[PDB]
Amino acid sequence: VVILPEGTQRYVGRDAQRLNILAARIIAETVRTTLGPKGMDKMLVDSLGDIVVTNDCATILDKIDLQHPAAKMMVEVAKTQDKEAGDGTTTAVVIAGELLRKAEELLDQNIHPSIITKGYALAAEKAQEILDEIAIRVDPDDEETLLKIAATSITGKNAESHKELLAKLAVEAVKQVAEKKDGKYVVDLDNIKFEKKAGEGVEESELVRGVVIDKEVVHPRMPKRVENAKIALINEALEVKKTETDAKINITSPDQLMSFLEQEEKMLKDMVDHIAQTGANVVFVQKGIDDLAQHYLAKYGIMAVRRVKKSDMEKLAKATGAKIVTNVKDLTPEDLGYAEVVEERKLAGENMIFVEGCKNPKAVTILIRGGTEHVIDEVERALEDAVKVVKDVMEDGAVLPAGGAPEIELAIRLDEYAKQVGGKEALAIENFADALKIIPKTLAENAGLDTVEMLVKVISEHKNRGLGIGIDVFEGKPADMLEKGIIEPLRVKKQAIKSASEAAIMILRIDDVIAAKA
Amino acid sequence: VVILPEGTQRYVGRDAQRLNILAARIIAETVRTTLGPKGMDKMLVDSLGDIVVTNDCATILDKIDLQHPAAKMMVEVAKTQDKEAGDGTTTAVVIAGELLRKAEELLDQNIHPSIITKGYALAAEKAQEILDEIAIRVDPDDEETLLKIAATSITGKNAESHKELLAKLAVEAVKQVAEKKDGKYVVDLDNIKFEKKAGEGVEESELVRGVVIDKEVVHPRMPKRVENAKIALINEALEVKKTETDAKINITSPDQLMSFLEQEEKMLKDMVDHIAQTGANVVFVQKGIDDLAQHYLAKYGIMAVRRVKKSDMEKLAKATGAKIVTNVKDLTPEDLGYAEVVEERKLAGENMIFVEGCKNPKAVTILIRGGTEHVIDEVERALEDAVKVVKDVMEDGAVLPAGGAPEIELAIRLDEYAKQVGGKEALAIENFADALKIIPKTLAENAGLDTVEMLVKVISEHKNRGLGIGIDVFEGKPADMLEKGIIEPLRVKKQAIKSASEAAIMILRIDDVIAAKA
Amino acid sequence: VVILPEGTQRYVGRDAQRLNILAARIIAETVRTTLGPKGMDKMLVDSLGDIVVTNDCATILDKIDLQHPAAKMMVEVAKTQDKEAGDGTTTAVVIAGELLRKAEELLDQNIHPSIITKGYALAAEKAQEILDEIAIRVDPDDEETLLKIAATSITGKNAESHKELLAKLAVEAVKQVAEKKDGKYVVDLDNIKFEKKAGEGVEESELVRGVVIDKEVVHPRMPKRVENAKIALINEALEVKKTETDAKINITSPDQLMSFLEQEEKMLKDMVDHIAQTGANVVFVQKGIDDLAQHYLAKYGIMAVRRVKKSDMEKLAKATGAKIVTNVKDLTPEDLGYAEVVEERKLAGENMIFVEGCKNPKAVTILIRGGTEHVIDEVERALEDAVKVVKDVMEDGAVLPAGGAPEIELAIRLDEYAKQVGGKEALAIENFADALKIIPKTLAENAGLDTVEMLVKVISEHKNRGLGIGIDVFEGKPADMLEKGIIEPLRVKKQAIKSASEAAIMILRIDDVIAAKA
Numbered sequence A, B, C: 001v002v003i004l005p006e007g008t009q010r011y012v013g014r015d016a017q018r019l020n021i022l023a024a025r026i027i028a029e030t031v032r033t034t035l036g037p038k039g040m041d042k043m044l045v046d047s048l049g050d051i052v053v054t055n056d057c058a059t060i061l062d063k064i065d066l067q068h069p070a071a072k073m074m075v076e077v078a079k080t081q082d083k084e085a086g087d088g089t090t091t092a093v094v095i096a097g098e099l100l101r102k103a104e105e106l107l108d109q110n111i112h113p114s115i116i117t118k119g120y121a122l123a124a125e126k127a128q129e130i131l132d133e134i135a136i137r138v139d140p141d142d143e144e145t146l147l148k149i150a151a152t153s154i155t156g157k158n159a160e161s162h163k164e165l166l167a168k169l170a171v172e173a174v175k176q177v178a179e180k181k182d183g184k185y186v187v188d189l190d191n192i193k194f195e196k197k198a199g200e201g202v203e204e205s206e207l208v209r210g211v212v213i214d215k216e217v218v219h220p221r222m223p224k225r226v227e228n229a230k231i232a233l234i235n236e237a238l239e240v241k242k243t244e245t246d247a248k249i250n251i252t253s254p255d256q257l258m259s260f261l262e263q264e265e266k267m268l269k270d271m272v273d274h275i276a277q278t279g280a281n282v283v284f285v286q287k288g289i290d291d292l293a294q295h296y297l298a299k300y301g302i303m304a305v306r307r308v309k310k311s312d313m314e315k316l317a318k319a320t321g322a323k324i325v326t327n328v329k330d331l332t333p334e335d336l337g338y339a340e341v342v343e344e345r346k347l348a349g350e351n352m353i354f355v356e357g358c359k360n361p362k363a364v365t366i367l368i369r370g371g372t373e374h375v376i377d378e379v380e381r382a383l384e385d386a387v388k389v390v391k392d393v394m395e396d397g398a399v400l401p402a403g404g405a406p407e408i409e410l411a412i413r414l415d416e417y418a419k420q421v422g423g424k425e426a427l428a429i430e431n432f433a434d435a436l437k438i439i440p441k442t443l444a445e446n447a448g449l450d451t452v453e454m455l456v457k458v459i460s461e462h463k464n465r466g467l468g469i470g471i472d473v474f475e476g477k478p479a480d481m482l483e484k485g486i487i488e489p490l491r492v493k494k495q496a497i498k499s500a501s502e503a504a505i506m507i508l509r510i511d512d513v514i515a516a517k518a
């Protein structure tokens, strides 16, 4: 009896489970090869022919056009991990897939999914308690640890050769814009701008304690450089203003043609004279600037830029100290900001404006250079992560060893926790624990090392030497990650397990898939 | 389990590396035949049937409709190299492709791409140190070296027959518009205009110390030639102005029909009278010029040109010393510029205006002639490179011998550097050094010389006589490029190695290619 | 000008070389994964849905539907290798592919193909002289070495589990049918029959010193088992004979209807009576046997089999000592053969005839058993190889160590030979030598070992300890293959290099490929 439209696909019971799990596993296997120091990159070409080259799991899954529903669900794991902690997007997806693979073994044994799910929930919740406890507490602004955090992040990506420079830029940027409420830091990454310009190489990238704007000085006669600049920030256009209410001039005599023309000329001139009277010698206008206004600005020796993006206006205010004024007439000297140097320079033959040497900038700019556009897009992505993990640590004065040390610590301990729980739930908890080993395993795998042996050695050494013991993919053997300065934010592991877990549990609870005809 | 949409193609591991490297190598092989004094040209015809004949690598790769993603990535190397240094766009692409070719040998040897990549990064960085060290520091404005620089880039092109003249024009143009701030020059290429008219031959090309504009004198009665011109630059249109605010005339008596008409006439006449009264005998207006105004301008014996391009207005300001005035009302004698001669002349039966004999022009024009439009376009491309390299040396102040000399030096030193690094990384540094040899090799190949023997002889002589030893494709033997005066800017090699190596490394880290169905 | 038909595709020079070499390398790369103890198998499915699962390179290349000509040429290397020596089909293909790869490096260096080809031919001729010299002369029938040769051949294939048994069977079979003319053995493999029957396991396979035939006793009343059998072999049908010349009985009286009828009965009965009178109790007839004849054979207590295959008749003759007679009338007791037992037995419910316990059989049978038809076929393939290499050693009393030891010995000596030759030819010889290393290389690769390291260690150990040092893919380290008993026939290496060198040189000579539209 026709219930569903023709074309509808339906999978139930083990079929639905097998399909969903295999799809999540394949997605995970697909990105696991990007994991770690020896992890490699992917080239993604969309339907329009646009090209993306990354190592970033979140970027990869967001780009490829996935069909299977379960595979789509995995994308959400990478996305949420990316928004919360920056790093660990590959880790969260890979663990989620392994979690599902280990669970099907129990499903094949006929253990009820509610049992597997209960076990996984207990293990995930226990894992958070363990992470909070083993986490190494540190000074939120300790520069050395911060640098280590950032450097660890910038490894296994094609800009690692400059990890020292890049890490240094990321840490300075975050600490500079970090807001200390009382004893805890808060960081708004919207205050750190990334400006990219192909040319030169990655080595030439730098941190500008101010703002770099992709704009030109509006008029040729205006100064191209201003030493101790007094910056004015106007968001209203420097043009003849018109009332909000409809209005029209009704002319009844010839002399009015000139009187109204002259009145508009005076209004334009007054605005500029007013700006000049504050002492400002540099002005950023968010809207346009009438030619007449430009001429007067130039006549006054004032450097002006029009059509400045709102977000840039805000960064300019935070960097220079100037206050954005809506109406030119409200502009006062107390509204002016400061910059050691404001100058129009060319990068790759393209004029740009630098606002540098600001006092205590609340907004900052990292100028990225590189031999090619693709290379520069990938450096920005590497910096986006570096900056997030540094932020993680400044807001959570906690870190963990890297190199799979944490997941090993969790596997050992969770396996012990399973024993105190007992029964079928214990089975699930042991599998959850075993699942966490894909990290060390894949780290070794991507490095071409014998995975079975590396595991035996690392777990054994870890049991003997403690928390910091992880895998050194370069030397191909266990090592103390803490001593090696190979660390990551506590938040990366915490969010990774939360997203991986709740998603695995959700997929494991599905025993019916009903898909309409596309 | 259908994960990716049908029609999606994917290549992984060795297959990915193999396909990406082959595509890049083929692009390099395609352009390497244009390299050097004996390099040949390409004829590119697009979908619409437009024809481009050139020796320029950037242009060639820009025009070709490339399909493969890796090939597309090779276009960026050429583009960045072009924006930053002008010359060496072919060199950068050829090195990139060879770098990849040498790397695949290590990949086939099973050496991890992470190691090859690190080795390549070490070599690239070391290469920059070496280049900075062997670079020959020169006088930023030394005419003789600047001339050798220009003449060197011009060789191997369609206009080489006239390299002497063309090198002279390029050098003179840059020197003239060059700005000294503090022992260091800065050059804005936008101040050098290229105007081209088919007719005569390339030999008739010249440098105009002012501006050449493709415009006519607006009114038949105006002077076609003005001696010691007093030039006025106005951007507002010479016409009845209207308020920004909506306005309309409400006529209530017949006398107003004439009074309002006479007021608009008076307004036009006043604008012209005001211009005349400043003493200006030549006026360039960015916008339009009303017929009545043209008439009064003609009555005053004032030559006028309308709808002048903004960039041209700016070049006129810089060359004549005139100040662009927005409103006629603000024009004054102090805004007027000077030109020994302003005249309308016909080139190949087409009217143009020459503003020549300017005092100390800050903007200049190279008038290009040629027996064909295609010839002239290519001569322009040759001049663009020449002006850029001349700029490189004035801004920087370092040159290098040419003829493959810098790359031989590099190969020789990187080989030793390899030895001090040792290990699998040294193997990669060695291959990187070997790759740099495609330059001398292709310089010889394009010349029809025996590549294997030329390389042996050049490398040997270079080890004996030093840095200046490179290949002489005319004499067909090693030679001191420095003695011959065959030099190139330091910036060319530095950028070429940076873009070539970062692109190669990036391509090398790809082990997964996923392309959607177009 | 249209010279070639539309649809025709052509590649010249570098392009032809690149395409041909790439196609041959890919093919080699496809089969190298089957090489050695850790090599795996392929499942081949044709268009008809027929399945072939094997490890045998010759079979793989034969069953796959190759398109590229260069790839098809590689098939011949495997086929010729297989026909002449049995084992080493993968080795030959893999070397040819590697040779072409190393050659392209020289082509890219602009070394003329005739020179590369010259060096390769010299290296290959030298290799044969080296193999003849280092070859270990052994006793043609030394069961000990023969057993090692067979066992070494069988490993690396499913059914290696039973290598001890299978090697034993292969050796006993060859030793038995071998004909010694004078210290020199000659073996005709057609004297060793392979009979396959699914059921039981590979372990139940056995050697029958006689013949097994897929046939039944023609008459139910005949004996199903005969102790000391006196075997008669007749190829003429036991039916009423007709003249070659057309003939027809012209009946003119009623009594002739019975007389001619009774005459044919008598002719038939006489044939049988004659067979019985010789003493024969077992009879194999190549053609048919009329029911009346069957009836009388049964009455006589004689077991008979009709429609016996010609090839089986020859095997029964050589095995039992019987002589095949054309006409029954020519049969004499001296023509009868002997078998300790001749019996019809059911295998997997199917009737078969066993002729076992023959005196000194010159034809023998290896009965293959296994739990699946596919297992059975792959076992037969393993036995075909095992039997061929045993044959190689008995005809050529010479062996070599395995584990890549031979190619390592050649690579070392050929590298020195190169220095003696010098010039560009030395470049090709050195490359030929280096190419031989893929054997040791992929042997290790398929084992998951670190290629670069294994090579360094084996070449080093080989230089210190000598000829027998190869790679022990099990212990994962260099070892003396001679001490380990891991050896191969001299003929394998000899033919491998001959076929691989001549093919490589042929492909390398191609600089123009012209293919018509199908």
Ligand SMILES: Nc1ncnc2c1ncn2[C@@H]1O[C@H](COP(=O)(O)OP(=O)(O)NP(=O)(O)O)[C@@H](O)[C@H]1O
Binding pocket: A034, A035, A036, A037, A039, A055, A056, A057, A058, A086, A087, A088, A089, A090, A091, A092, A152, A153, A155, A156, A385, A401, A402, A403, A404, A439, A443, A471, A472, A473, A486, A488
């Ligand atoms: N020097 C190192 N040695 C060993 N392991 C390291 C090192 N640096 C980082 N790691 C580990 O490598 C993993 C990070 O790899 P990575 O490829 O960046 O993926 P991810 O962080 O999981 N996701 P994402 O960065 O968001 O794409 C973590 O498990 C780290 O602890």
Ligand SMILES: Nc1ncnc2c1ncn2[C@@H]1O[C@H](COP(=O)(O)OP(=O)(O)NP(=O)(O)O)[C@@H](O)[C@H]1O
Binding pocket: B034, B035, B036, B037, B039, B055, B056, B057, B058, B086, B087, B088, B089, B090, B091, B092, B152, B153, B155, B156, B385, B401, B402, B403, B404, B439, B443, B471, B472, B473, B486, B488
């Ligand atoms: N007289 C000369 N003798 C020998 N080599 C020369 C000479 N003049 C130039 N070269 C070399 O030729 C190369 C420049 O060739 P060219 O065809 O202009 O390509 P490119 O500079 O690499 N790229 P592009 O200029 O951007 O099109 C450089 O490697 C020079 O060192």
Ligand SMILES: Nc1ncnc2c1ncn2[C@@H]1O[C@H](COP(=O)(O)OP(=O)(O)NP(=O)(O)O)[C@@H](O)[C@H]1O
Binding pocket: C034, C035, C036, C037, C039, C055, C056, C057, C058, C086, C087, C088, C089, C090, C091, C092, C152, C153, C155, C156, C385, C401, C402, C403, C404, C439, C443, C471, C472, C473, C474, C486, C488
């Ligand atoms: N125990 C062993 N240890 C190491 N190498 C071995 C061992 N046994 C055999 N070999 C080597 O493995 C190779 C044979 O592998 P195999 O997969 O049978 O391919 P092949 O003989 O080249 N061709 P085919 O005709 O398909 O069998 C030879 O180079 C042997 O010397």
Ligand SMILES: [Mg+2]
Binding pocket: A087, A088, A153, A385
């Ligand atoms: Mg990361």
Ligand SMILES: [Mg+2]
Binding pocket: B087, B088, B153, B154, B385
């Ligand atoms: Mg050039």
Ligand SMILES: [Mg+2]
Binding pocket: C087, C088, C153, C154, C385
């Ligand atoms: Mg074999």
